[PDB]
Amino acid sequence: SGFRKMAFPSGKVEGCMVQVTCGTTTLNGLWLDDVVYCPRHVICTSEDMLNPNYEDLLIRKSNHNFLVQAGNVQLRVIGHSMQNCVLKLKVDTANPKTPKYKFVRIQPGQTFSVLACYNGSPSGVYQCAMRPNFTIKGSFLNGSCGSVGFNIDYDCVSFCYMHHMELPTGVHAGTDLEGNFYGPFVDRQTAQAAGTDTTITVNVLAWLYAAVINGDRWFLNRFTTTLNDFNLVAMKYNYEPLTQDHVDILGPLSAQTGIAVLDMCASLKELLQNGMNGRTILGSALLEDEFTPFDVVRQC
């Protein structure tokens, strides 16, 4: 038993991280087959972030303006390309540590494992959720850009995030591995800021199932609620609306605990209106919304 924010083993991504330098900027790149992926804002100087024309910037670079480094071994760029906000450096040698992989884009509310990297060297790994406003609450310092997020499906690595920037509230924004940003963020100097966020309702129910499976039961009650009534309360507390499909997704957890979803909803309603009265759930004094139903099933 026990329930803890858990990350995927990082070994299969660690062997793909390289270091990419272009001018006076260094960040991380992802090396798969004979291609290195990294944020395109590498080819832009700090003094020019205000008004970059990446088309022009890429026409004025040559293969030899990019220094790619895999540990001690230097990779030689034989082609360079720009897919949306991601740069593709074609190199002479296919990475021999290339795992089976896919490029997938995730939905707000899903989670993934971040491998924070500096100078091509992995430094830490931890789980994140895509906030409904398309930011993540990560931990990144200067040189972190090009770090990637991913899920592991039986030896197959699903890349879903590449880190591009840190918004002024201290949260983090990036793209998928096709270079398409999550949310209304652009890779240029602007006052851009995180929009208003909301609580991920289905996840909170997941985490309440996780708590009963771990012996925390003090919030259960005999009542059940209707889907529509629960949603009237949810919206009052800035919780995203719950759908029948979310209910169906929580089926496996409801059957393992024998508590119907709308029963747990009645429990969540009461928590929202009274708080916990000095108690805790799975060692926390707040309702946690960063575990998906699948994250719970996976630890039970």
Side-chain angles (χ1 to χ4, degrees), residues 1-75 77-216 218-300:
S1 295
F3 195 77
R4 279 306 244 77
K5 206 164 290 212
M6 206 174 270
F8 282 112
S10 54
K12 292 182 292 297
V13 175
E14 290 168 46
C16 303
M17 301 319 298
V18 296
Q19 163 194 265
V20 198
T21 294
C22 172
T24 47
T25 296
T26 297
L27 50 60
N28 309 284
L30 190 69
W31 181 18
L32 305 175
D33 302 313
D34 46 335
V35 175
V36 178
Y37 307 81
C38 69
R40 82 176 160 173
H41 69 67
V42 68
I43 64 160
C44 190
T45 60
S46 293
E47 330 81 74
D48 286 351
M49 287 327 279
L50 217 286
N51 177 17
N53 180 255
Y54 288 101
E55 265 86 328
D56 287 340
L57 284 176
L58 198 45
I59 301 310
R60 304 172 184 154
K61 302 275 154 168
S62 181
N63 291 338
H64 66 77
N65 303 136
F66 312 87
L67 181 74
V68 177
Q69 284 177 207
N72 287 326
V73 180
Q74 181 226 26
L75 269 46
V77 181
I78 59 173
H80 56 269
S81 240
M82 193 210 318
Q83 167 169 4
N84 305 116
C85 300
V86 155
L87 188 147
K88 303 175 61 134
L89 302 176
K90 194 181 170 68
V91 287
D92 39 10
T93 88
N95 163 40
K97 298 190 63 175
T98 310
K100 218 157 320 195
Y101 66 91
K102 291 167 331 206
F103 290 169
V104 174
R105 174 181 266 249
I106 65 173
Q107 294 286 312
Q110 315 201 222
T111 56
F112 57 92
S113 304
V114 165
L115 180 68
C117 293
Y118 302 87
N119 295 283
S121 292
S123 164
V125 55
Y126 59 86
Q127 197 77 351
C128 278
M130 191 45 86
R131 297 312 307 172
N133 66 7
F134 293 104
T135 68
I136 61 172
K137 310 163 165 179
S139 182
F140 295 113
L141 299 180
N142 295 342
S144 55
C145 298
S147 295
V148 306
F150 63 96
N151 285 293
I152 302 274
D153 302 28
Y154 215 117
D155 292 343
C156 172
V157 188
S158 266
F159 295 104
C160 56
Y161 180 82
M162 170 171 288
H163 185 54
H164 285 243
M165 48 196 228
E166 183 178 2
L167 283 144
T169 53
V171 302
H172 297 103
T175 71
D176 57 32
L177 272 288
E178 317 285 5
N180 304 310
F181 256 96
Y182 291 95
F185 306 113
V186 293
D187 52 348
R188 52 186 177 79
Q189 193 62 204
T190 72
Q192 49 185 319
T196 51
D197 206 51
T198 178
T199 294
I200 302 151
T201 304
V202 64
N203 286 7
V204 178
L205 299 167
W207 170 80
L208 294 175
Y209 283 104
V212 317
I213 296 178
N214 277 270
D216 269 322
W218 66 257
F219 54 80
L220 298 186
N221 65 39
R222 64 192 185 86
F223 304 112
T224 71
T225 194
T226 79
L227 192 50
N228 303 323
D229 295 322
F230 175 82
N231 274 322
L232 235 299
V233 176
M235 92 180 285
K236 301 257 252 162
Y237 291 81
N238 199 25
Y239 274 52
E240 256 164 326
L242 195 80
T243 71
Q244 185 62 34
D245 196 53
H246 290 149
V247 171
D248 292 341
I249 278 147
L250 293 155
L253 288 166
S254 68
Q256 169 175 3
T257 68
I259 329 183
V261 175
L262 303 176
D263 182 357
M264 197 67 83
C265 286
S267 277
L268 180 50
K269 183 178 179 180
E270 187 173 59
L271 285 172
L272 287 180
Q273 312 197 287
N274 310 128
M276 284 177 222
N277 260 79
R279 282 159 299 179
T280 65
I281 306 187
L282 283 178
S284 153
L286 308 167
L287 310 173
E288 302 289 330
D289 79 334
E290 289 224 344
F291 305 91
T292 58
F294 165 92
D295 299 332
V296 175
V297 167
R298 152 177 172 224
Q299 287 171 73
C300 328

